Amino acid sequence: AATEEQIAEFKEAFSLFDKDGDGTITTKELGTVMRSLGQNPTEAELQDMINEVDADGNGTIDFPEFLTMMARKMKDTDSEEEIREAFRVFDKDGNGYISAAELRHVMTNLGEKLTDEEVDEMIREADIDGDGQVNYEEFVQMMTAK
Amino acid sequence: NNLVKTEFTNETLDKIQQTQDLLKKIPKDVLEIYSELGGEIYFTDIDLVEHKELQDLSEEEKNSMNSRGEKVPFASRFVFEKKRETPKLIINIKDYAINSEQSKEVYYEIGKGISLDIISKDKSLDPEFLNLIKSLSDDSDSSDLLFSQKFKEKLELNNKSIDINFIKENLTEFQHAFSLAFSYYFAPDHRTVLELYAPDMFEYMNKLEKGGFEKISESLKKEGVEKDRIDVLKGEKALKASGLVPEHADAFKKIARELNTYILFRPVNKLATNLIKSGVATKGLNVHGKSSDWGPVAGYIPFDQDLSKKHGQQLAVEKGNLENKKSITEHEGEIGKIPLKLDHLRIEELKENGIILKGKKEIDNGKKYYLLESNNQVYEFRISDENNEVQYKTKEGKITVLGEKFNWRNIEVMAKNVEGVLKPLTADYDLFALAPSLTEIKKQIPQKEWDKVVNTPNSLEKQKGVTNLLIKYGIERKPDSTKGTLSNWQKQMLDRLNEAVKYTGYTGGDVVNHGTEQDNEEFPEKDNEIFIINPEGEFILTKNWEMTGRFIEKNITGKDYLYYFNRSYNKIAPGNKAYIEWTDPITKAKINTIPTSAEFIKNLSSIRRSSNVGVYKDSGDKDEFAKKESVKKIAGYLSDYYNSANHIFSQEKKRKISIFRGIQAYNEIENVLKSKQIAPEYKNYFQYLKERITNQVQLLLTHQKSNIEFKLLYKQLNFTENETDNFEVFQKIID
Ligand SMILES: [Ca+2]
Ligand SMILES: [Ca+2]
Ligand SMILES: [Ca+2]
Ligand SMILES: [Mg+2]
Secondary structure (H helix, E strand, O other), rough: OOOOHHHHHHHHHHHHHHOOOOEEEEEHHHHHHHHOOOOOOOOOOOOOOOOOOOOOOOOOOOOOHHHHHHHOOOOOOHHHHHHHHHHOOOOOOOOOOOOOOHHHHHHOOOOOOOOOOOOHHHHHHHOOOOOOOOOOHHHHHHHHHH | OOOOEEOOOOOOOOOHHHHHHOOOOOOHHHHHHOOOOOOOOEOOOOOOOOOOOOOOOOOOOOOOOOOOOOOOOOOHOEEEEOOOOOOEEEEEOOOOOOOOOOOOOOOHHHHOOOOHHHHHHOOOOOOOOHHHHHOOOHHHHHOOOOOOOOOOOOOOOOOOOOOOOOOOOOOOOHHHHHHHHHHHHOOOOOOHHHHHHOHHHHHHHHHHHHHHHHHHHHHHHHHHHHHHHOOOOOOHHOOOOOOOOOOHHHHHHHHHHHHHHEEEOOOOOHHHHHHHOOOOEEEEOOOOOOOOOOOOOOOOOOOOOOHOOOOOOOOOOOHHHHHHHHHHHHHHOOEEEOEEEEHHHHHHHHHHOOOOEEEEEEEEEEEEEEEOOOOOEEEEEOOOOOOOEEEEOOOOOOOOOOOOOOOOOEEEEEEEEEEOEEEEOOOOOOEEEEEEEEHHHHHHHHHHHHHHHOOOOOOOOHHHHHHHHHHHOOOOOOEOOOOOOOHHHHHHHHHHHHHHHHOOOOOOOOOOOOOOOHHOOOOOOOOOOOOEEEOOOOOEEEOOHHHHHHHHHHHHHHHHEEEEOOOOOEEEOOOOEEEOOOOOOOHOOOOOOOOOOHHHHHHHHHHHHOOOOOOOOOOOOOHHHHHHHHHHHHHHHHHHHHHHHHHOOOOOHOOOOOHHHHHHHHHHHHHHOOOOOOOOOOOOOOOOHHHHHHHHHHHHHOOOOOOOOOHHHHHHOOOOOOHHHHHHHHHHOOO
């Protein structure tokens, strides 16, 4: 039962990526519609959703097709927050940024020994903009991204 | 807190290799006594005179009694102590000597001494008998009535037994004493002149170095924290406005320690404190009745709402009763109404508290009625004797705000079920939050699942594998049928808080019914005061919605305890449409973060729904579509920024390669911000998105080769037709 807010976005983004501006999107396109919106399904799980309802040009999903296909993974997933709290947790100082310092730290408290190597290591492979530290944004990805 | 600031490094060694030679001489802790009183020592070049950037009129020379004995010629000095608050020691040197006649380096000693002295063992605690008896080595202890080196003028007063009979007088005199004594023991030459011409003061300054200096280096260090801390009125001083029940709080004091987790509660109304100790069960979730604060009913949830705070509100009192009625019609057998029976104490209490006046008596139908008084002006109350029930009626000259007028009826209150018995209801303990120790949650997880996660290869997944655990078992809050919405451990903890207050002396079931108000997303509320039972008993009650928020940041958040704050904080709470502010780090550092694809598309989506005009309208204007296509680009550049495959690169790279993706976007923005007529509502958003990108880039930059300012670096780009060599340029642009 997506909230209206959960619609304006879902459409404000369903259209922005609709070139031949009708009201249906190509396969390749649906993929793009979902990424932007944070999400980023797999190369073949992008079918089971659309592939399951071909009442269109056999390979095109309208809006009432799209909005009613955002439950298969949505009314279920309510985890965004769990994750945003597991952030302020690591963010041990109040800088809104995490750091190998605190990662390793909190890592140990939860009872786990990390090597000062494999930390200035995690942080890295977690950092996307090279600023040495992981902000919420990338923290999010690392976690959710599969 | 760097204690020794070296002004001019002009002279090579010698200056240096002369200051050090001086500092390695003074006791590593006489300093810590200094670098504790907030002092700093200044070693400068030839500023000598009032030339020092700190020697100007502040608190200079009022009454002369300077150098060891006396002098006063300022212009002829090198060592000086800015005597007044934070001891400032300033010194200098010219050409290369200090030894030979150390009659010079002995002032940089006392001149120093006058730092710790007045606040040393000679006065801060007060002139403690240790020194009160050390000053008596004037001429009473040993056959050494020798002190012709500190007591010439102000103490040639041998004919005066020096104890508490005049020492308070010349405190400063016994300072020139703690100084020229300090100066000798530590002087680089005459160390025994304080071991010969002095009998004990040597043994004193000695015990001093023995440990004396590490002493005040700890009572000043301890007071260091305890001093400038956060007001909190601990002890039973707060447990008094905490409303909680002492035997209970004290009971709770045992669990915190056991499980090691803070426990914070909102305020338990006083007019319920004792009802609780009495045996009155608490108001769970099932009842949405309003308490009351006047009359016998006080502290009870009258089934009559015009008998609770809201006396008059013809609507909240109207739609107020309406709530109990259902509170019962819905949950019957558990929720209902039983007649008000004020026992013994309860009365003597609503007495000196001022809620009731017990006086005149009377007879009706056959029983005794003492009557109860209360300046309420539409209701009269009276209590029986046989069974101290209570009753009221509409005064003979008035009506009920709703529109009723009744004569003497037994006063019913709301009461839930408690072992097959309808006990009257009162205030409960609504925990404000439970702060378990991160270390505790570890104990929550079951070894099996945790082990299966650490025995992993991918180090990055070993984190995702962990945090999900830290979330799974310690942050997740499922809703519940009975106990409101709460965590899983939160529950157990919540049972152990009751089984705790019931293995003491409570007979009203449980007293903590629902979850931690930090989940009252629905109707969140803000309470200035907050009671907090530390992880070790210490009772505490904040005072500000900040002090609270500050207290939690200090010794909770940034201290290894796991705490999460109300989802509805910072947003608008639906239930009560309330804006409750709470420092959020993530939001603190938004100003400098390139927003996401979705966080962008999102924000548009939001303004669309308001001014009912989107960034782009559904039309044919190849001008409009121009704009549409255009966001589709900013919605890429941003997405392209946070590319997960950015790892196969290397730091210096990551920054750059993004500083561009960033620019790339700041551009296409500046692009549309110039195009057609995009409503001034979106104008701003974009105006804002710029500053982000900007700040965001200024950052990635001031991380590597910093001097180039965004603005400038910008100009220098050819965003015309080709984008190929552009980047190639950018490179060198930063070398
Ligand atoms: Ca289409
Ligand atoms: Ca941090
Ligand atoms: Ca980063
Ligand atoms: Mg409650």
